[PDB]
UniProtKB/Swiss-Prot annotation:
Localization per record: Cytoplasm
Pfam families with a match to the protein in the record: Pept_tRNA_hydro
GO cellular component: cytoplasm
Molecular function terms, GO-annotated: peptidyl-tRNA hydrolase activity; tRNA binding
Top-rank taxon, per record: Bacteria
Matching CDD domains: PTH
Active site: 23 (proton acceptor)
Name by which UniProt lists this protein: Peptidyl-tRNA hydrolase
Biological function: Hydrolyzes ribosome-free peptidyl-tRNAs (with 1 or more amino acids incorporated), which drop off the ribosome during protein synthesis, or as a result of ribosome stalling.
Major subcellular site: cytoplasm
Amino acid sequence: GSHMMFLVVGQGNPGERYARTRHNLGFMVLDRLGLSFRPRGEALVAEAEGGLFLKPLTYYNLTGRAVAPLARFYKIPPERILVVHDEMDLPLGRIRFKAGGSAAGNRGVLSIEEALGTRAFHRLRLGIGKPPDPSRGAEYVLSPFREEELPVVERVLEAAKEAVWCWVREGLPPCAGRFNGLDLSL
């Protein structure tokens, strides 16, 4: 319709090179929802149930360029914006809803904060852990998960799919109550 009730944003980079990488977890979650995405401007967009699901094709670090004009245009309040992203500050196997707060160095979240001028939007943080040395962070997020991690990633994607629908239909607090305590690790 002419209006949108919510905006779910998956963080990722465009192209097959990135599709299995840790930094594309947000895209992977959106791709599990069973929606029909269509190219619109610099994004793939899907609709369902009165709102919008966005896989920006801006590159990860530039997603604010797409998110902010859309959210302002549709007058979407912060508690009806959900940014789904990989999170180095949580271990693989943890999933957390967060209302507002800092980006903690995540360039996608930072781009959106800078473009909107607020931190108050919601996030679904999907832990990925950290590399053994920080100097490998860039390579870590642009690499596929390890062999031994795959079963945990699968659980996380299943949980995160359900969590996205939870947030869409219920709002953040009930969903934080169901999901934030989960331990999906091996």
